[PDB]
Amino acid sequence: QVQLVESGLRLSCAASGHTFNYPIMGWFRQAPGKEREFVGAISWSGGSTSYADSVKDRFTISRDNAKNTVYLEMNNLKPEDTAVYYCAAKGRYSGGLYYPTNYDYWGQGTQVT
Amino acid sequence: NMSFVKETVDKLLKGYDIRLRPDFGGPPVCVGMNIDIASIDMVSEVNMDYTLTMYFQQYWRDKRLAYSGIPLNLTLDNRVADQLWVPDTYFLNDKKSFVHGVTVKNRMIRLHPDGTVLYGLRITTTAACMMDLRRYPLDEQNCTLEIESYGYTTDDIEFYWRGGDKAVTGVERIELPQFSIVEHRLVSRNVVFATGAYPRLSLSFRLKRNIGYFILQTYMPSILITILSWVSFWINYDASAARVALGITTVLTMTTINTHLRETLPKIPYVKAIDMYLMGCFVFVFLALLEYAFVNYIFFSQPARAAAIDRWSRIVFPFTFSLFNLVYWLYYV
Amino acid sequence: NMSFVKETVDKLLKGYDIRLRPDFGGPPVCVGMNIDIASIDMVSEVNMDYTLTMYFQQYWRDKRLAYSGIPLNLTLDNRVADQLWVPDTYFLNDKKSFVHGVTVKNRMIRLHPDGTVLYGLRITTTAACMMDLRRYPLDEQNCTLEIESYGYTTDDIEFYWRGGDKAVTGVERIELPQFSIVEHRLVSRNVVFATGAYPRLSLSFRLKRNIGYFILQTYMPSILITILSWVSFWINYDASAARVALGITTVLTMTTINTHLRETLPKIPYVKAIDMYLMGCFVFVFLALLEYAFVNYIFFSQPARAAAIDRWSRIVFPFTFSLFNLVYWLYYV
Amino acid sequence: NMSFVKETVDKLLKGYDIRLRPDFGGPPVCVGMNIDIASIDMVSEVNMDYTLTMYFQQYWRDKRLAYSGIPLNLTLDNRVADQLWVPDTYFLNDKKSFVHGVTVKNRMIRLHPDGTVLYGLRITTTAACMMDLRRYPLDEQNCTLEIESYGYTTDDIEFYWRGGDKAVTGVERIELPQFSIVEHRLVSRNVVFATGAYPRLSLSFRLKRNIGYFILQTYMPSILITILSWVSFWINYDASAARVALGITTVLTMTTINTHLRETLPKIPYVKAIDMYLMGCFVFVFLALLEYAFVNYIFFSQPARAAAIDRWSRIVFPFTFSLFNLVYWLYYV
Amino acid sequence: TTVFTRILDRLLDGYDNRLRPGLGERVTEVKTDIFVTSFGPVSDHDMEYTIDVFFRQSWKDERLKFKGPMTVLRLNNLMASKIWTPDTFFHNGKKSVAHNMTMPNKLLRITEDGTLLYTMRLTVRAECPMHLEDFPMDAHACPLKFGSYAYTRAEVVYEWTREPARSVVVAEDGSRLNQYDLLGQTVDSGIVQSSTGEYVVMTTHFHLKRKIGYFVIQTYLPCIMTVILSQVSFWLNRESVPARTVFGVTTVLTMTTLSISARNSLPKVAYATAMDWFIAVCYAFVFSALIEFATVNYFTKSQPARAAKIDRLSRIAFPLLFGIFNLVYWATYLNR
Amino acid sequence: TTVFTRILDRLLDGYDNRLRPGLGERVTEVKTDIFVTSFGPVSDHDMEYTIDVFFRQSWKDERLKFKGPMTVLRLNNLMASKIWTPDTFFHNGKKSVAHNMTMPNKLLRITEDGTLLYTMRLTVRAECPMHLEDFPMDAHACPLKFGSYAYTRAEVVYEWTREPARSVVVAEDGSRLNQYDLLGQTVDSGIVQSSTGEYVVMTTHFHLKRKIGYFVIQTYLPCIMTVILSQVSFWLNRESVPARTVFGVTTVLTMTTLSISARNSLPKVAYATAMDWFIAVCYAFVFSALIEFATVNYFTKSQPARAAKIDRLSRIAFPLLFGIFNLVYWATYLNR
Ligand SMILES: *[C@@H]1O[C@H](CO)[C@@H](O[C@@H]2O[C@H](CO)[C@@H](O[C@@H]3O[C@H](CO[C@H]4O[C@H](CO)[C@@H](O)[C@H](O)[C@@H]4O)[C@@H](O)[C@H](O[C@H]4O[C@H](CO)[C@@H](O)[C@H](O)[C@@H]4O)[C@@H]3O)[C@H](O)[C@H]2NC(C)=O)[C@H](O)[C@H]1NC(C)=O
Ligand SMILES: *[C@@H]1O[C@H](CO)[C@@H](O[C@@H]2O[C@H](CO)[C@@H](O[C@@H]3O[C@H](CO[C@H]4O[C@H](CO)[C@@H](O)[C@H](O)[C@@H]4O)[C@@H](O)[C@H](O[C@H]4O[C@H](CO)[C@@H](O)[C@H](O)[C@@H]4O)[C@@H]3O)[C@H](O)[C@H]2NC(C)=O)[C@H](O)[C@H]1NC(C)=O
Ligand SMILES: CCCCCCCC/C=C\CCCCCCCC(=O)O[C@@H](COC(=O)CCCCCCCCCCCCCCC)COP(=O)([O-])OCC[N+](C)(C)C
Ligand SMILES: CCCCCCCC/C=C\CCCCCCCC(=O)O[C@@H](COC(=O)CCCCCCCCCCCCCCC)COP(=O)([O-])OCC[N+](C)(C)C
Ligand SMILES: CCCCCCCCCC
Ligand SMILES: CCCCCCCCCC
Ligand SMILES: CCCCCCCCCC
Ligand SMILES: [Cl-]
Ligand SMILES: [Cl-]
């Protein structure tokens, strides 16, 4: 199993366990009156990053394997960026990247206003 | 009466449309699956894949093929499968696959009076399995086989393991050279792509590498060479030839081991733990040889300093090697 | 009702001419393309290519296939793809390609009421990629996949990336143990041959090679043997046999490493970075042996000069090797 | 007037029965065979096979294909061979064969007014040739290609070489880098299996291996090392380090030569001629080293005896080596 | 010719190739036999072997009875695709080839009473599990198992044409074995069970024994010569110390080279074979000789008598122990 | 849209693809051209070379004349299977590939006057026999010959679409060669006669020149360094017998290793190459240096003046002779 704890503006999500079986870590945010929405995804090994157009050029995602922690640096915050955040892990053959249903392990809700 | 059977079979295929799935436009068709693992041919760390041969059986129901008056299960020729609708099941993590075709195509079609179709194939598949070689040879792998419908979404077809945990058989009789199958696991879920959601079945094996002979093959010679390199500190300076022989032999042996044994090890350009351990032992024996050279150099002018250096080395080298081993095992076990 | 769908499909395929493209004799047909990369199995410098597995999807419009009265998108069996016009898309730089065919041919046909056709394949292709190994193993490669229409010119067909720069996905799935994906790029253009102009799409990746394995396996042994060769200076010059043996052993070990480091590389004429480093280390050990030879020649009459030469070598050789390493690692990094 | 030709060809193939051989139920049909050897590709001792590319032509008569009114030989499209009867000729000793299919299938069908049919193919076949390598590299092999009819016995078909001994052409133009085709031979016979007696044709080549490569590769290095091992006898016995190093290095060089040679051949469980030569040279160098060891053990108390032993060995070793070479080259040549 | 065409048309009129003979009334008996034209190479690395066979089957189909000027019709192979034929497959086959040069290598013969003889030429790559604890002095029994794929024992059964010992015939010159010797074959039949039901299996075990000459001239003799060469160093005089240093270092290097080179030839298994033990003991002897030189040189300048005694005792202890080990090893592994 | 369907149906009505155009009336003329997209690698061991081409053919068929709104019909690749096409094949091909991804890479175009343009994409592995006497400073002319397989020169002839020099065009970025330089190509035509008659053959020779950097940095330089090291031994004092003996014997060992390792890429020819001559001369120099040391050590105690004179003369003779040999060798081979 994989245990993820996120806290944090700069959010840090530290993951422990079988992180090799889940090489992709993604970020999601849920609006108070809507459903979850993709934010970004980071590969553990290559460091490749993918972003959503709604938060692109404002958020940065990196990772460090010394402690197995993925960092989401947030800049130029806007009132449209008020949502409860989540950090999730995705399997190697789990399919799509922008869909929350494909992520197995999640984290704990973080409030940002 | 074979004529009646022929007439019934012709009537079943009369007007049959292979382009339409059962219950087209209605509820999804449920497909059960069984796998009988004949063998697992080879597991490759260089190519990051494993070869597996299996009897793959699919079970479904088609009401267009329901027949009456024949109290038998009709096992038909395999070519009949070309005139029937079959699921578009495929493996996501495969690199090459084929269905055996000697003497005829290895395929079975069996119909039942209620319209149930059993469709069996014999498939040899090479499936990719990414491996974490950082802890090699103390590693533990998890290799999966993925099964999914290529074209039909969850609104059209559904998958399940027929028989629950007994769907996959024959795992316990598989013998691997360098691995032992600790466990196997069956998973069913749904996977969402940009074109929609599809059913997914997963068959995973957890492989533990046999460490009984790896310790005695690649670690023990290096540790013994390091100890022999230490032995040189207990020899008096009048027997300098023995010290020279020991130092040169140990250094050359470590160079040969690093250059050749790692070649015998998988040739993937990876940084394993065994490489780090061998490099540490090589550095230790090289430092021992350098220490002997320094002692020999300062021997004539300052014999007392040389004796003190040898006495201190007798304590320092084993202690430092013990600390290095402790750190290595803490960071890799 | 399945009969209504069957008769609608038969009416659609009645009178359909597969030999004629959509809007034949008129405006060109616009074809959009999507690629979903599964993995890059291997990247080979010996054969100068790379194996790529992908879901290749094409989107076009054929008014002859427009149907009414069925408010659904008909996902048909892949065999009906043999009865429809599909673009003659090919890859210019591929060397061996195939469509996976277990259990069935991994092909998808989806029709829409407006007449739009979605056509998907799962393809493994060995695409050629010429590489420049002058900086190996500190090199950065660029490998491309070229997509073109063979028989249809720009007056007949048009290619474009459906979705803009978001037309290629699965880049994060690429896991090469020796490389790392840096950037991927999409290009659209036209290529003119003697038969006319043709649309062209290009998917390009930039790869950066890892250096840790080569540091652990090639540079460190050479550095250690070079440092070992300097012990000869600290030995008394009267011990001719010992110094000659040490120098010859260092030279032979260097040559053995060079001959054993052939690796999986082509027989290129230029000098790679690793070749330059090995030649430098060999030059250093050869110069050390020559210095000893000069000392042995001259010490029988001028012992003071020989002692001075050894003392100056003890400082000159490490400093020169440090300068060589500094120059090498500043030029190649 | 191609309309008349089309009508004639359609009339010929109207009631034609491909399931029945010409003169079915009557006298056997006679098939003549011609072969034009385009090339003989790699000959492998490791895989025990050779590759052969040939134009294989079969000539027979079918009275059902006789036509009149067309004073021409009809060279038809190769696809028309799918509608005519052709012999089921196969090669018994082949492991993998194929007919070249670029740009089209390399197949020729020609019809004559009297019903004669000429049917040509271009076949690249790998054929098994078991080799007796006991005299390697001075051996001589005999590789055959066997041609037989699979289904029809001698009561239905009979083969012959069309043109006698001139049936096979192109042998004299074959250039094998390592061999030379001394002779080729044609045989016709009958082979009786449990299912009956079948006609059989045999095309055999006698290959003689060239020796220049092995002279430049194995024999000369071993001879030179053995000659160099005799330099010890001209060094004074008190120079222990020099003579010991010379003997040890000669032994090591001989072992390395043997190990490098025995890597590109099958694991044959017998001693080849080159193995005997290498073992003889190793015995000679080992005996030289042991002679020096015996001299070293006794020169303290019997200097005269040691000097006599060295002086006698100086002439005894070359004489015995010359005798060994004479015997070896008389026996194997 | 026309009469035979009419006979064939009558035979194929109304014939259903999707239904086996005696469907729902009796069991289809198929008599099988094999003529091995050449027993191909056996691979230790892949644990497989190749075999080329004439595979013959015969069965009774009453729908194919006729009457005419000939009692047997020896027809083209394409006719076999118009009637029902058994779906025989090899259980342990890996990747087999049905030869298609220059035409499909199949023969079909129909007797007037309904008997069908159907023969094909095949190349089979079959699995052969090997236990290599006695390498290179090990014997194996490589199996070849075949049977029906879709028809259970209540529908299609298999029998040997003649007595089982004589139903698998190997050609006199049909051998492509380099490092193996073919001792014989054992022929049997049985019943296997799977999730789809019970099937009939025909099994043929080929007994192979590996030849040891190559490994004697390749590995054992160089190791023995290296051990003897290392033991030679004990006979040098009291002033040839650099000579003994060279002897020890070079012999240890040679043993490392031989141990590493021989490891590539060995199959990649996870246990110890006989060759591994031999190489380990030779390596131990060479390192013991080096340690003996070191301990003799340790006492040389202080206690010469002890060093002389150690050298004298070693000169007879090392060869005697090596000979005893060789006798024990060869008696153990050549009588098994 | 149905007008073109009717035209195509009328063209194929009463059309037979078994018969070449103008059968019994004239000679079918095919105009051919080649666009080499990537001249692939050259294999010395197999004496072959790979080449990827667009192969274009054009001819005239009066049966395919039509009148319609469009002068040229650019049809699908499956139309070509319904019409007569030339049976062109490569005489020296080994195993060619007609690509099928994602569809058969063929284009067919029909002009209103009956002209057919038929183009395909191919990967041809052809035979290139090589004379390796001047290896690694050799040049080759790899041929590519193609022509009809079944139609003699009285039925089907081949011609180049444009001037023969411009009828085979190589792409600028189409060089996959690693150790060869493409100096150009020559284009010719001729008649080849076989037992089935006389045929027209079109030939294109590609001129290749080998690069020498790899062999210079892997073979020549190590040999030169080994010879220099062997000749350095002359400057050591005569009293250091072990030093000079080790020098000579290890240089001989290195020369043997290099001589064995050099002949590993080239096919096992039966003659001697230039690199073989260079290695033989280097080996002779090293062996002669060791023999000279042995001779000097023989006379060092009886006639020391003679030994000193021999050593001093060798110090001048050996480097001068090696330099002269190198100059002669490189002047002879670098401008062959
Ligand atoms: C090799 O590595 C792979 C991963 O790469 C491992 O595969 C995972 O295996 C675990 C089981 O060990 C799987 O977890 C199980 O998934 C089931 C399917 O989940 C889908 O359906 C549920 C609803 O039923 C959805 O909520 C979910 O989002 C999915 O759509 C679950 O049904 C299982 O639930 C079980 O546990 C929970 C508590 O955790 C209970 O509440 C349930 O009642 C039930 O008992 C479970 O969560 C996981 O999905 C697999 N991942 C992948 C990617 O396949 C292999 O196990 C590993 N190999 C080995 C040998 O260990
Ligand atoms: C590019 O070219 C390659 C060949 O170089 C093509 O690959 C061949 O494709 C054809 C057509 O699909 C295949 O022929 C068909 O084979 C079916 C059986 O396939 C199995 O068995 C064969 C061996 O016999 C295996 O090679 C194969 O992998 C399968 O295991 C037959 O059932 C088909 O016959 C049916 O259709 C024909 C249609 O005319 C009817 O006449 C028959 O009665 C029957 O109903 C047919 O023979 C061929 O096997 C493929 N070969 C290989 C090596 O793959 C590519 O398809 C082609 N690409 C494109 C885009 O066309
Ligand atoms: C360049 C080379 C350098 C290397 C050096 C070269 C030196 C050359 C010098 C001499 C060469 C002498 C001839 C060698 C012939 C070998 C082949 C042969 O005939 O094999 C035979 C087998 O052989 C055996 O069964 C014997 C095995 C034991 C060998 C001796 C071990 C004990 C040595 C104790 C020493 C103690 C010393 C103590 C200290 C003083 C036949 O093999 P086969 O046909 O496959 O038969 C297999 C049959 N089977 C399947 C039933 C099993
Ligand atoms: C660990 C390593 C151990 C080994 C040792 C390491 C040593 C390290 C020390 C030094 C490092 C030196 C490195 C050089 C590398 C050059 C590579 C290269 O590209 O060469 C190029 C130059 O090729 C020529 O010029 C061809 C002719 C060479 C003649 C050499 C004569 C030597 C004479 C000595 C006399 C001594 C007499 C002594 C007397 C006592 C090859 O050209 P190309 O591109 O392949 O082909 C031309 C193509 N073109 C047509 C486009 C032009
Ligand atoms: C192994 C033999 C080495 C040489 C010994 C010479 C003296 C023998 C005295 C019995
Ligand atoms: C493994 C071989 C060990 C041999 C030991 C011999 C001891 C001799 C003491 C005089
Ligand atoms: C076989 C090589 C012999 C070399 C002898 C050198 C000295 C000769 C003195 C006459
Ligand atoms: Cl074998
Ligand atoms: Cl090349």
Domains of chain C by residue range: 2-208, 212-331
User: Phi first, then psi: what are they for F157, rounded to 5°?
Assistant: -120, 160
Look at ligand 4, atom 52, and give the residue with the nearest C-alpha. Answer: F211
CB contact under 8 A, E55 and B235: no
Mutate to test the interface with E, among B249, B267, B278 (most CBs of E within 10 A): B249
Query: F124 pairs with which residues across the strands?
Result: F51
Helix axes B220-231, B240-264, angle to 10 degrees: 160
CB C88 within 8 A of CB C11: no
3-state secondary structure F223-292: HHHHHHHHHHHHHCCCCCHHHHHHHHHHHHHHHHHHHHHHCCCCCCCCCCCHHHHHHHHHHHHHHHHHHH
CB contact under 8 A, F260 and D239: no
What number of other Cβ atoms are within 10 A of residue E200's Cβ? 19
CB D84 within 8 A of CB D65: yes
- Indicate where chain E has its CATH 1.20.58.390 domain(s): 213-334
Resolution (A): 3.1
Domains of chain A by residue range: 2-112
Among the atoms of ligand 4, which is closest to the Cα of residue C281?
A: 1
A20 touches chain B (CB under 8 A): yes
d(CA F11, CA B267): 61
* Tokens encoding E241: 């110390």
CB contact under 8 A, B192 and A99: yes
- The closest ligand to the CA of E280 turns out to be 6
CB C36 within 8 A of CB C53: no
Find the distance separating the first CA and the last CA of chain E, reported in whole Å: 65
CB contact under 8 A, F176 and C275: no
Chain B contacts of C2, Cβ < 8 Å? 17, 20, 24-25
CB contact under 8 A, B108 and E150: yes
What residues have a C-beta under 5 A from ligand 8, the ion?
Answer: E 41-42, 177-180
DSSP code for B103: B
Known binding-site residues of E equal 56, 119, 235
F and C touching (3 or more beta-carbon pairs closer than 8 Å):
yes
Residues within 6 Å of ligand 6 by CB: E 284-285, 288, 310, 313-314, 317-318, 321
CB C146 within 8 A of CB C92: yes
d(CA B293, CA C17): 88
Domain E213-334: assigned CATH number: 1.20.58.390
Look at ligand 1, atom 61, and give the residue with the nearest C-alpha. Answer: B206
- Give the minimum alpha-carbon distance from C28 to chain A in angstroms, rounded to a whole number: 32
d(CA D184, CA D172): 10
Nearest to E102 by CA among C328, B261, D248, D88: D88
Cβ burial of E236 (10 Å; 0-12, 13-18, 19+) is buried
- Domain F2-210 bears CATH identifier 2.70.170.10: yes
3-state secondary structure F63-116: HHCCCCCCCEEEECCCCHHHCCCCCEEECCECCCEECCCCCCCEEEEEECCCEE
Regarding beta strands F168-170 and F48-60, do their DSSP bridges make them parallel or antiparallel, or are they unpaired? unpaired
d(CA F239, CA F231): 17
d(CA E66, CA E13): 13
- The closest ligand to the CA of D134 turns out to be 3
d(CA B129, CA B94): 9
Angle among Cα D108, D114, D119 to the nearest 5 degrees reads 15
CB A36 within 8 A of CB A57: no
- Give the minimum alpha-carbon distance from D43 to chain F in angstroms, rounded to a whole number: 11
CB contact under 8 A, C103 and B88: yes
Look at ligand 3, atom 19, and give the residue with the nearest C-alpha. Answer: E213
d(CA C86, CA C109): 10
d(CA E8, CA E66): 9
Residue B279's alpha-carbon distances to B138, B286, C212, C217, in angstroms, are 17, 10, 13, 9
d(CA E146, CA E158): 10
List the single residue in A20, A21, A95 with the smallest CB-CB distance to B192. A95
CB contact under 8 A, A97 and C175: no
Pick the CATH number of B212-332 from 1.20.58.390, 3.30.1300.30, 1.10.1760.20, 2.160.20.80: 1.20.58.390
d(CA B4, CA B19): 28
A and F touching (3 or more beta-carbon pairs closer than 8 Å):
no
d(CA D250, CA F250): 9
CB F151 within 8 A of CB F28: yes
* Tokens encoding D135: 């005299």
Which subunits have 3 or more CB–CB pairs within 8 Å of chain F?
C, D
Helix axes C220-229, B273-297, angle to 10 degrees: 10
Which subunits have 3 or more CB–CB pairs within 8 Å of chain C?
A, B, F
Between the CA atoms of D261, D265, D268 and D273, what dihedral angle is there, to the nearest 10 degrees?
-50
Distance in Å, CA E326 to ligand 3 centroid: 12
d(CA E192, CA E201): 7
Regarding beta strands F28-43 and F156-160, do their DSSP bridges make them parallel or antiparallel, or are they unpaired? parallel
Nearest to F200 by CA among F216, F189, F186: F189
CATH superfamily of A2-112: Immunoglobulins (2.60.40.10)
Chain breaks in chain D (C to N over 2.5 A) after: none
Among the atoms of ligand 1, which is closest to the Cα of residue B188?
A: 18
Nearest to A98 by CA among A24, A23, A8, A10: A24
Nearest to F191 by CA among F156, F153, F223: F153
CB contact under 8 A, B238 and E150: no
Query: C46 pairs with which residues across the strands?
Result: none
CATH domain D2-209 topology? Acetylcholine Binding Protein; Chain: A, (2.70.170)
- What is the SS3 assignment for B225? helix
Q: Which CATH architecture has domain D212-331?
A: Up-down Bundle (1.20)
In chain A, the residue whose alpha carbon lies closest to the alpha carbon of B94 is A93
Interface of C with B in 166-205 (CB under 8 A): 169, 175, 177-178
- Give the minimum alpha-carbon distance from B298 to chain E in angstroms, rounded to a whole number: 21
d(CA E182, CA B316): 61
- List residues of C whose CB lies inside 8 A of any A CB: 169, 171-175, 180-181
Single-letter amino acid, residue D56: F
Between the CA atoms of E272, E278, E282 and E284, what dihedral angle is there, to the nearest 10 degrees?
40
Q: Which of C222, C254, C282, C285 to mutate to test the pocket of ligand 4 (most atoms within 8 A of CB)?
A: C282
Angle among Cα F251, F255, F258 to the nearest 5 degrees reads 135
CB B116 within 8 A of CB B31: no
Chain D contacts of F43, Cβ < 8 Å? none
C45-63 exposure pattern, b = at least 16 Cβ within 10 A, e = fewer? bebbbbbbbbbbbbbbbbe
- Give the minimum alpha-carbon distance from A1 to chain B in angstroms, rounded to a whole number: 13
- Give the minimum alpha-carbon distance from D193 to chain F in angstroms, rounded to a whole number: 34
Interface of B with C in 214-273 (CB under 8 A): 244, 248, 251-252, 255, 258-260, 262-263, 267-271
Does C183 belong to an annotated binding site?
no
- What is the SS3 assignment for D304? helix
Residue C36's alpha-carbon distances to C112, C125, D292, F100, in angstroms, are 22, 14, 74, 21
Q: Which CATH architecture has domain C2-208?
A: Distorted Sandwich (2.70)
Regarding beta strands D29-44 and D168-169, do their DSSP bridges make them parallel or antiparallel, or are they unpaired? parallel
CB contact under 8 A, B151 and C9: no
Chain breaks in chain E (C to N over 2.5 A) after: none
d(CA C205, CA F144): 35
- The closest ligand to the CA of D262 turns out to be 3
Look at ligand 1, atom 8, and give the residue with the nearest C-alpha. Answer: B187
- Experimental technique behind these coordinates: cryo-EM
* Tokens encoding D275: 């193995």
Residue A72's alpha-carbon distances to A13, A41, A55, A91, in angstroms, are 8, 10, 12, 20
CB contact under 8 A, C175 and A46: yes
Single-letter amino acid, residue F293: F
DSSP per residue over C89-139, as a string? Answer: EEETTEEEEEE--SBS--EEEEE-TTSEEEEEEEEEEEEE-----TTTTS-
d(CA A36, CA A31): 7
Between the CA atoms of F164, F168, F171 and F176, what dihedral angle is there, to the nearest 10 degrees?
-130
CB A46 within 8 A of CB C175: yes
Look at ligand 5, atom 5, and give the residue with the nearest C-alpha. Answer: D294
Look at ligand 3, atom 37, and give the residue with the nearest C-alpha. Answer: E323
3-state secondary structure chain A: CEEEEEECCEEEEEEEECCCCCCEEEEEEECCCCCEEEEEEEECCCCCEEECCCCCCCEEEEEECCCCEEEEEECCCCHHHCEEEEEEEECCCCCCCCCHHHEEECCCCEEEC
d(CA C251, CA F229): 10
d(CA C231, CA D311): 40
What number of other Cβ atoms are within 10 A of residue C28's Cβ? 16
- Indicate where chain F has its CATH 2.70.170.10 domain(s): 2-210
Distance in Å, CA E220 to ligand 3 centroid: 7
d(CA E164, CA E144): 14
In chain D, the residue whose alpha carbon lies closest to the alpha carbon of E233 is D293
Alpha helices in chain E (DSSP H): 2-12, 213-215, 221-232, 241-265, 274-298, 304-334
- Domain F213-333 bears CATH identifier 1.10.10.60: no
CB contact under 8 A, B242 and E294: yes
CB A46 within 8 A of CB C40: no
Q: Indicate if ligand 2 lies below 6 Å from the C-beta of F196.
A: no
Helix axes D220-228, F241-262, angle to 10 degrees: 170
Nearest to A102 by CA among A38, A31, A55: A38
